[PDB]
Design an enzyme around this catalytic site. Structure first.
Site, PDB file in Angstrom:
ATOM      1  N   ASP A  62       0.784  -1.218   0.000  1.00 31.70           N
ATOM      2  CA  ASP A  62       0.000   0.000   0.000  1.00 31.70           C
ATOM      3  C   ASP A  62       0.832   1.293   0.000  1.00 31.70           C
ATOM      4  OD1 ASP A  62      -2.572   1.552   0.201  1.00 31.70           O
ATOM      5  OD2 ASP A  62      -1.750   2.074   2.234  1.00 31.70           O
ATOM      6  N   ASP A  90       4.669   0.539   3.919  1.00 31.89           N
ATOM      7  CA  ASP A  90       4.489  -0.718   4.637  1.00 31.89           C
ATOM      8  C   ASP A  90       4.302  -1.861   3.644  1.00 31.89           C
ATOM      9  OD1 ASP A  90       2.010   0.028   3.588  1.00 31.89           O
ATOM     10  OD2 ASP A  90       0.878  -0.363   5.419  1.00 31.89           O
ATOM     11  N   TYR A 136      -8.056   1.661   6.617  1.00 33.76           N
ATOM     12  CA  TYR A 136      -8.893   1.987   5.450  1.00 33.76           C
ATOM     13  C   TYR A 136     -10.356   1.610   5.737  1.00 33.76           C
ATOM     14  CZ  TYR A 136      -4.685   3.246   2.946  1.00 33.76           C
ATOM     15  OH  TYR A 136      -3.513   3.864   2.528  1.00 33.76           O
ATOM     16  N   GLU A 147       4.650  10.643   4.211  1.00 32.17           N
ATOM     17  CA  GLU A 147       3.905   9.447   3.786  1.00 32.17           C
ATOM     18  C   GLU A 147       3.945   9.402   2.255  1.00 32.17           C
ATOM     19  OE1 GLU A 147       0.490   8.692   7.212  1.00 32.17           O
ATOM     20  OE2 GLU A 147       0.077  10.183   5.674  1.00 32.17           O
TER      21      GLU A 147
END
Ligand SMILES: [Ca+2]
Ligand SMILES: [Ca+2]
Ligand SMILES: [Cl-]
Ligand SMILES: [Cl-]
Ligand SMILES: [Cl-]
Lengths: 446, 172
Positions: free
Chosen positions: A56, A59, A206, A423
């Site tokens: 994703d 990770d 999510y 991120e």
């Protein structure tokens, strides 16, 4: 013009998806030398081959909701701007990457009403810091079925495969047909269960926030575009009263963005072009894009002083660049409002240029002036010692990754442990690729 | 226009990914004891290695000239979990080696205890027999009480040389 090399940025933003591959890799054709086989036991706990797909973010969890949303958005870019991809030499590259995700969604659908929606335990995955190829922990798989359904993630997957069926029609007719079969079955599963009770392993990562009616209509309208069976068009429109309204009103919602959780906005646009009747879908997309640009009825999204349309502290660049792609697509709609199209296209350019360097620095790893060099990404960093600070510099360049971005007054720090800033993610890059394709068409083709 | 099609992420490998560091753990008139740490800091790509071995080469000229032979050497250790130590094996001429085989142990860039494994082994001659480490190929550049990366202790992956060099004279 333009101000930046959009073709290079596009190339790199697509390459980012190669960096995210899970599963068995072919090292003889990879465009990089720092990714190897990983996640080869994915699915074995369930007795099924669930290898492949995309990790994703920084990770190694395979989260099918953002993964399928991202493949749908890349696919939508190819559907609208195929020639831009061909002229830039990126057409086979984008198809290869979209097929990487869709081959996985197919593995995840072993029977009509069974769908695996995640591999990896979020907490266990995030508890260790090292490269994908050497993950030491168990990686459980999770599924939804008729007794415990997942309409949100099953319908977004249907949509990605329906789009894949269209864009692969000419280059691989057999694969095209395979994607469509799965897309129709998945849609029937999501539509006849209308429930997320079984979707649980992504809690805290999510969640489905807006519910599944946007995904049902998004998948149905893509199935209409894929089949020309008007029953799918009827089906998409049938949920228009369910997507959501601004609080306390009957006005179709508009104060957010197309994103992994909410595909209402792109659905407005696709339906507006199909109906071409100067009706409610036109009105709804225009309300949305007006709020993001000049303002709607005296209200306007927050902008930073240096010109970023700023929706939220998380993935600020992701939301702005994805909305800019919708603005591009609107600008190319022949029956659209010409004065609004001009405004929307100038907005799309400004947001692309903010991501690429208009502030004096690039927010795309491996691109432009002073790019981020410490994205929060385990494999690019390459720690051998289960530590974010060892080594203190990344071993590899994660080319093309769009980072989270700045706060609402343009402040940003390039630090591996700064989450709002650094991120990176599949969904961050997905709308961005479409935006870059249009910018390349506008500015890079002569 | 169109972007430079030469673009790729095939990076320069800036560092030796798999290697042994070694040092002298103990010594005496008739023996040498080596501390060796096998490292897998792979990155291009990272990978798990479960068939690594290495070879420590000695020269037994002084043993032979004393009227003894390789069969008078003894390999020992009280510190070798996950490592098998061979008896001395003949290479060529009076060059012999101890193979240290870590096959079956996963060594990988995934944590302080994962990326490196320590082995200790001793090679002894009989009491009263001179053991001279100074003419031994794999002794070059080793020190007491410290470990350093050595190209003279070659590493093998399922028996295939991946780092360092065997003692080729004078013959390569
Ligand atoms: Ca939704
Ligand atoms: Ca000797
Ligand atoms: Cl085009
Ligand atoms: Cl949820
Ligand atoms: Cl290329």
């Amino acid at each position: 013009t333009g101000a930046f090399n959009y073709g290079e940025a596009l190339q790199k933003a697509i390459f980012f998806y190669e960096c995210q591959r899970s599963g068995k890799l072919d090292s003889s054709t990879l465009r990089l030398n720092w990714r190897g086989d990983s996640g080869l036991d994915d699915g074995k706990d369930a007795g099924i081959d669930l290898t492949g797909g995309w990790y994703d973010a920084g990770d190694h969890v395979k989260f099918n909701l953002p993964m399928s949303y991202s493949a749908a958005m890349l696919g939508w870019a190819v559907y609208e701007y195929e020639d831009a991809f061909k002229q830039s030499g990126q057409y086979n590259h984008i198809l290869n990457n979209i097929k990487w995700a869709c081959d996985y969604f197919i593995k995840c659908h072993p029977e009509k009403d069974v769908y695996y929606y995640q591999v990896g335990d979020g907490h266990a995955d995030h508890a260790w810091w090292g490269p994908a190829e050497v993950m030491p922990m168990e990686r459980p798989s999770y599924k939804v079925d008729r007794s415990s359904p997942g309409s949100t993630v099953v319908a977004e997957t249907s949509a990605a495969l329906a789009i894949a069926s269209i864009i692969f029609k000419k280059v691989d007719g057999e694969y095209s047909k395979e994607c469509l079969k799965h897309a129709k079955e998945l849609f029937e599963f999501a539509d006849t269960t209308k429930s997320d009770d079984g979707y649980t392993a992504a809690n805290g990562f999510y969640n489905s926030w807006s519910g599944f009616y946007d995904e049902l209509s998004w998948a149905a309208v893509w199935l209409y575009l894929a089949t020309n069976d008007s029953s799918y068009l009827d089906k998409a429109e049938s949920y228009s009263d369910k997507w959501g309204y601004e609080p306390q009103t009957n006005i179709p919602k508009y104060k957010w963005a197309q994103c992994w959780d909410d595909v209402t906005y792109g659905t407005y646009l696709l339906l507006a072009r199909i109906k071409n009747d100067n009706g409610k879908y036109k009105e709804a997309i225009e309300r949305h894009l007006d709020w993001w640009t000049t303002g709607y009825n005296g209200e306007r999204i927050t902008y930073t002083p240096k010109g970023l349309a700023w929706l939220d502290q998380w993935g600020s660049l992701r939301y702005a660049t994805t909305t800019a792609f919708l603005a591009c697509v609107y600008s190319d709609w022949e029956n659209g409002d010409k004065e609004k199209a001009k405004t929307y296209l100038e907005f799309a350019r400004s947001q692309a240029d903010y991501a690429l360097g208009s502030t004096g620095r690039s927010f795309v790893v491996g691109f432009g002036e002073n790019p981020p060099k410490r994205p929060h990404h385990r494999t690019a960093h390459g720690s051998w010692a289960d530590s974010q600070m060892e080594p203190p510099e990344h071993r590899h360049v994660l080319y093309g990754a769009l980072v989270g971005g700045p706060d609402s007054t343009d402040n940003y720090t390039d630090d591996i442990s700064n989450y709002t800033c650094n991120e990176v993610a599949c969904d961050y890059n997905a709308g961005f690729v479409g935006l870059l394709a249009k910018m390349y068409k506008l500015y890079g083709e002569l | 226009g169109s972007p430079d099609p030469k673009f790729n992420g095939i990076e320069e490998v800036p560092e030796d990914e798999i290697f042994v560091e070694a040092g002298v753990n103990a010594s005496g008139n008739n023996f040498i004891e080596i501390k060796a740490i096998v490292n897998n800091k792979s990155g291009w790509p990272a990978r798990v290695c479960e068939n690594l071995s290495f070879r420590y080469f000695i020269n037994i000229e002084e043993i032979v000239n004393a009227g003894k032979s390789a069969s008078d050497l003894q390999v020992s250790s009280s510190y070798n979990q996950g490592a098998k130590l061979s008896d001395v094996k003949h290479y060529k001429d009076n060059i012999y080696y101890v193979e240290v085989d870590l096959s079956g142990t996963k060594i990988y860039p995934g944590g302080q205890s994962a990326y490196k494994k320590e082995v200790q082994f001793r090679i002894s001659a009989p009491e009263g027999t001179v053991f001279n480490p100074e003419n031994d190929y794999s002794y070059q550049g080793l020190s007491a009480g410290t470990v350093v990366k050595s190209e003279y202790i070659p590493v093998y992956d399922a028996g295939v040389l991946v780092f360092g060099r065997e003692p080729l004279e004078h013959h390569h």
